[PDB]
Amino acid sequence: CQKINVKQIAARLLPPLYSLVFIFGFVGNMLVILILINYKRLKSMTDIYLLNLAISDLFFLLTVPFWAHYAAAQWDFGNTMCQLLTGLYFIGFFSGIFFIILLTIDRYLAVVHAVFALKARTVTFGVVTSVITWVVAVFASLPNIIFTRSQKEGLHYTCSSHFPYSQYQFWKNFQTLKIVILGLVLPLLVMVICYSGILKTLLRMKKYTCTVCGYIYNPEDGDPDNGVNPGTDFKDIPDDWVCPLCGVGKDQFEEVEEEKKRHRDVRLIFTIMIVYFLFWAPYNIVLLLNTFQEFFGLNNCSSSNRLDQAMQVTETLGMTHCCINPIIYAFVGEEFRNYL
């Protein structure tokens, strides 16, 4: 068996691709950072988390031109930069998802537990949680920065991670589960718990009109005369209940179209999380497949080279995501459109 040489392809394909993701990302993110302070004026907890999410992206973007040069030639920046850039990449990766989860839990706290929302959703506490988030991200990145060095291999310089020989398999497995759990498994649980909890709180809030007379059932008012307590969802009401005006069943009732512009905050943060999974989930799956190829997949010569190739391709897609977040704000968020 023998591995494949991708240097010839990558030295042609990666430098113009990376440079453009950089141009479009640096410009895109700086526009976001500026508009959040100079127009939006950081009024809520969302504004603090979205700001830090754009900083984590810029941190990721700062490393991009260095990767473009390394792909095209070699590592001409030394050891200091090698660790410092792999650092900003990891710190930028972890804090990025960490702030998306904090933007998810935030919407779960605003929709559900509305009484606790107004009580504990300050700008000062938002900054405090943000300081501790950037710290946790650093500690998560820390082992990966340490085992990264820039070494000369024959006539070429490299900037890669080299785990300790004696415990090579343990660090390979431990770092795989740390990236996969904190980047896919953990936020995926948060996306399931929160958004199903938000949707069930939203659903209760919907108003239903009688298609016969026009009676609008408000959940907040209910129907005490017939025995329907206030707050109760229309769907949750027994079928035997009739219209308090004409006397028709729940079947001859339709959903009132909603101006989901309150829920525009929920609709945007949902797109940030969903689109994060289109760029980062393919890499996270392949990472688990490549590390656990023996006893959990195909360990053969051909399949291993295919897995390593798929890992580079899917980490290239994941990297591209740092320039994608402004496009979501430009389309989903009506506020960003109003600035132009």
Q: Which residues bind Zn ion (CB under 5 A)?
A: 210, 212-213, 215, 243, 245-246
Q: How far apart are the first and last CA of the chain?
A: 58
Residue 219 phi, psi (nearest 5): -60, -40
Burial track 216-253 (b if 16+ CB lie within 10 A, e otherwise):
ebebeebbeeeebeeebebeebeeeeebeeeeeebeeb
Query: 161 vs 305, which CB is nearer to ligand A4X?
Result: 161
Q: Outline where the chain has alpha helix (H).
A: 7-38, 45-72, 78-111, 114-119, 123-146, 168-180, 186-204, 264-279, 281-291, 301-320, 325-331, 334-339
Please give the order of strands across the beta sheet that includes 216-217. Answer: 216-217, 208-210, 253-255
Residues of each annotated binding site = 210, 213, 243, 246
Residues of each annotated binding site for Fe cation = 210, 213, 243, 246
Binding stretches for ligand A4X (CB under 6 A):
67, 70-71, 86, 89-90, 93, 144, 161, 172, 175-176, 179, 291, 315-316, 319
Task: Take residue 43 and report the two structure tokens written for it.
Answer: 């009024």
Query: 47 vs 315, which CB is nearer to ligand A4X?
Result: 315
Task: Name the residue number minimizing CB distance to Zn ion.
Answer: 243
CB of 62 to ligand A4X, least distance (A): 12
Q: Outline where 75-224 has alpha helix (H).
A: 78-111, 114-119, 123-146, 168-180, 186-204
CB of 130 to ligand A4X, least distance (A): 21
**Which of ligand A4X, Zn ion, none does residue 213 bind to, with CB < 5 to 8 Å depending on kind?**
Zn ion
25/4 Cα distance (integer angstroms): 31
Query: 79 vs 175, which CB is nearer to ligand A4X?
Result: 175
Tokens 């700008």 label which residue? Answer: 123
CB of 56 to ligand A4X, least distance (A): 12
Query: 22 vs 70, which CB is nearer to ligand A4X?
Result: 70
CB of 242 to Zn ion, least distance (A): 8
**Which of Zn ion, ligand A4X, none does residue 210 bind to, with CB < 5 to 8 Å depending on kind?**
Zn ion
Task: Take residue 100 and report the two structure tokens written for it.
Answer: 């998306």
CB of 216 to Zn ion, least distance (A): 10
Query: 45 vs 287, which CB is nearer to ligand A4X?
Result: 287
